[PDB]
Amino acid sequence: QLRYSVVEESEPGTLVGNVAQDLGLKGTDLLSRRLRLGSEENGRYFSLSLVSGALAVSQKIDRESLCGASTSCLLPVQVVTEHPLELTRVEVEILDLNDNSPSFATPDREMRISESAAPGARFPLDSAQDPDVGTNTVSFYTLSPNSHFSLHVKTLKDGKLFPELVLEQQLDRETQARHQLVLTAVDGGTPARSGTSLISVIVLDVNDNAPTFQSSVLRVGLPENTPPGTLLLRLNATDPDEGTNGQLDYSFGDHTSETVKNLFGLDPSSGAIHVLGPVDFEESNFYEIHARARDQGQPAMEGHCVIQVDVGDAN
Ligand SMILES: *[C@@H]1O[C@H](CO[C@@H]2O[C@@H](C)[C@@H](O)[C@@H](O)[C@@H]2O)[C@@H](O)[C@H](O)[C@H]1NC(C)=O
Ligand SMILES: *[C@H]1O[C@H](CO)[C@@H](O)[C@H](O)[C@@H]1O
Ligand SMILES: *[C@H]1O[C@H](CO)[C@@H](O)[C@H](O)[C@@H]1O
Ligand SMILES: [Ca+2]
Ligand SMILES: [Ca+2]
Ligand SMILES: [Ca+2]
Ligand SMILES: [Ca+2]
Ligand SMILES: [Ca+2]
Ligand SMILES: [Ca+2]
Numbered sequence: 147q148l149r150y151s152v153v154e155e156s157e158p159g160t161l162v163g164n165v166a167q168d169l170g171l172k173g174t175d176l177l178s179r180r181l182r183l184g185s186e187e188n189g190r191y192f193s194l195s196l197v198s199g200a201l202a203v204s205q206k207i208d209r210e211s212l213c214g215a216s217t218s219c220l221l222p223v224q225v226v227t228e229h230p231l232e233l234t235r236v237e238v239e240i241l242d243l244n245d246n247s248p249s250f251a252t253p254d255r256e257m258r259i260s261e262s263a264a265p266g267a268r269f270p271l272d273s274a275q276d277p278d279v280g281t282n283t284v285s286f287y288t289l290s291p292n293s294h295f296s297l298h299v300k301t302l303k304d305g306k307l308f309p310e311l312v313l314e315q316q317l318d319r320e321t322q323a324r325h326q327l328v329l330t331a332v333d334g335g336t337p338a339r340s341g342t343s344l345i346s347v348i349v350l351d352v353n354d355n356a357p358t359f360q361s362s363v364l365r366v367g368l369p370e371n372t373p374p375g376t377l378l379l380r381l382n383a384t385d386p387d388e389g390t391n392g393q394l395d396y397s398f399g400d401h402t403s404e405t406v407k408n409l410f411g412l413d414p415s416s417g418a419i420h421v422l423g424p425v426d427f428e429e430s431n432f433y434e435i436h437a438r439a440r441d442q443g444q445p446a447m448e449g450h451c452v453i454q455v456d457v458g459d460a461n
Contacts, residue, residue, distance in 0.1 A: 147235035154209040154243040166199025184224025244282040244335035261352040274331030285334035351388040353443035365454035381417030383439035391443035399436030
């Protein structure tokens with residue numbers, strides 16, 4: 147019947163539509179025919195003047211309150227005019243305004259990702275919300291430039307955007323334990339409104355590193371008269387991993403001969419190797435020990451060292 151429109155959040159007293167003019171009532175006709183609104187509920191947001199005959203906004207209207215996420219917001223009101231008693235249907239469309247900014251559940255987020263995460267891995271992200279309708283809702287996401295992660299936004303059945311991180315490079319806790327990203331949600335308004343979420347990616351430690359000796363090959367020389375308990379040398383292996391993954395225990399190689407095992411002995415903790423038995427040039431001029439540092443992780447890693455022992459002559 148009658149169709150008018152008014153912009154959301156417009157200040158009260160804002161003209162909506164000249165009902166009297168569109169109905170043919172002039173001056174006295176407004177009082178004589180008693181120009182009214184349907185009920186008390188009708189005049190909650192609107193007001194119809196007996197003087198001007200103009201329908202205007204009574205209370206500040208929020209489209210997010212009335213229609214929520216509906217595409218079209220139609221507010222029906224009845225205009226009653228007597229002599230003859232006739233009712234008129236008036237449909238006032240509340241035009242959406244871009245007054246809402248994209249919002250996140252939390253301003254800062256922490257994400258814990260395993261160091262062994264293979265590239266191509268996808269991690270979902272908390273989407274942003276924007277109660278506006280049409281293009282005035284969330285339009286796109288942007289991820290701050292970084293070296294390991296990428297942004298992938300997928301369109302859903304609801305028409306809602308679903309953002310997710312994509313791993314581009316192998317993470318390494320031993321270089322940087324933390325990454326910081328800025329996820330920005332932007333709507334499609336002019337000017338565009340936006341909201342941010344700060345993501346802190348914590349790289350969880352994985353036993354991906356094996357112990358390493360200070361020297362891959364070591365060569366020492368000891369006199370033939372060296373008594374038992376004499377300090378040959380102390381091993382120095384290091385592990386960059388965290389916790390039990392970074393602690394190690396020294397031991398001989400699996401293929402180590404019993405002669406060496408009886409001659410030398412190593413402390414699995416300090417890595418100090420001491421000579422237990424007697425040494426002579428007659429027996430053997432050269433001994434080659436295979437040192438091994440085993441990781442206290444899971445799975446266990448291990449590093450290998452080679453010690454070269456040269457024995458002096460008798461008499
Ligand atoms: C024990 O070794 C530490 C690490 O040295 C470094 O790591 C080893 C595995 C090799 O890659 C080597 O080239 C590096 O320099 C030393 O920082 C530390 O001083 C050493 N402790 C000693 C000598 O008492
Ligand atoms: C989100 O984006 C809008 C438009 O790009 C900016 O105006 C705002 O400051 C925030 O960075
Ligand atoms: C994105 O930027 C906003 C300011 O616009 C911060 O409040 C937020 O914590 C995030 O860093
Ligand atoms: Ca609003
Ligand atoms: Ca709105
Ligand atoms: Ca908006
Ligand atoms: Ca690593
Ligand atoms: Ca590691
Ligand atoms: Ca390790």
